[PDB]
Design a protein around this ligand. Structure first.
Ligand SMILES: CC[C@H]1[C@@H](O)CC(=O)N1c1ccc(C#N)c(C(F)(F)F)c1
Length: 249
């Protein structure tokens, strides 16, 4: 059980947003706290990714690029899981000190996006996703978005992705003596993974638009946050960098 041992060992712990929950809810305060949380989560995601089996097989510039492109999707998927395990998917558990109820979904001006994220969280319950399926799916999500023109060394990436697919297949919750069971399960989980990508795109769009207007609406963007959103995110939004889907959309 070496692979699952590693994934459990490297899984990030609790990350707080630093939000003041004693102040009335406002757009500026909610989004400033989400941005700070995004910066804090990025730091954890980088450390996590660099500790994954085989990650150092990637060329050095490909390493940071892969992390940066996948960051939003990784955050959303983990947040959906937190929401499932902590509040039964009824609210969005961004952090212990930043939990969105319906009022905050509205006040953040992100209601439609939050609906999609809550639906993702509900899928963990509907499909009875195991914590081990979650960990393997999240690892595979890192290797699910790349430039259409390819990476510096695309071969090493393709091999990594292949192996992460095989590890997911190995531990899916099914009865092996009935092949139909495992086929159905793999189909369900690949559909679930695909569904992260349109959600990440909506968040990319929202966050990009907010950065551009941030001076007008009093929303603060931290340094590393802002660089990714102005340099890497537009490569996604302009179609230079595209998600890898299992099924044809
Ligand atoms: C990253 C940018 C900020 C906001 O500007 C838009 C938005 O949705 N953000 C955000 C923050 C933190 C987490 C976490 N965890 C998430 C999610 F969970 F949705 F990925 C989004």
């Amino acid at each position: 059980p070496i692979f699952l041992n590693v994934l459990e060992a490297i899984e990030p712990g609790v990350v707080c947003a630093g939000h003041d929950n004693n102040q009335p809810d406002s757009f500026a305060a909610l989004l400033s706290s989400l941005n700070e949380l995004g910066e804090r989560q990025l730091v954890h995601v980088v450390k996590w990714a660099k500790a994954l089996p085989g990650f150092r097989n990637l060329h050095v510039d490909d390493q940071m690029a892969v992390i940066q492109y996948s960051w939003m999707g990784l955050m959303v998927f983990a947040m959906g899981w937190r929401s499932f395990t902590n509040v039964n998917s009824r609210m969005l558990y961004f952090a212990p000190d930043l939990v969105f109820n319906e009022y905050r979904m509205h006040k953040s001006r992100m209601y439609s996006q939050c609906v999609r994220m809550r639906h993702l969280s509900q899928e963990f319950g509907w499909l009875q996703i195991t914590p081990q399926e979650f960990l393997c799916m999240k690892a595979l999500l890192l290797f699910s978005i790349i430039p259409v023109d390819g990476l510096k060394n695309q071969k090493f990436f393709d091999e990594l992705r292949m192996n992460y697919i095989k590890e997911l297949d190995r531990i899916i919750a099914c009865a092996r003596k009935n092949p139909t069971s495992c086929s159905r399960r793999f189909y369900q989980l690949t559909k679930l993974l695909d569904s992260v990508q349109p959600i990440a795109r909506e968040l990319h769009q929202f966050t990009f638009d907010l950065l551009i207007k941030s001076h007008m609406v009093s929303v603060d963007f931290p340094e590393m946050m802002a660089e990714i959103i102005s340099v890497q995110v537009p490569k996604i939004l302009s179609g230079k960098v595209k998600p890898i889907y299992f099924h044809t959309q």
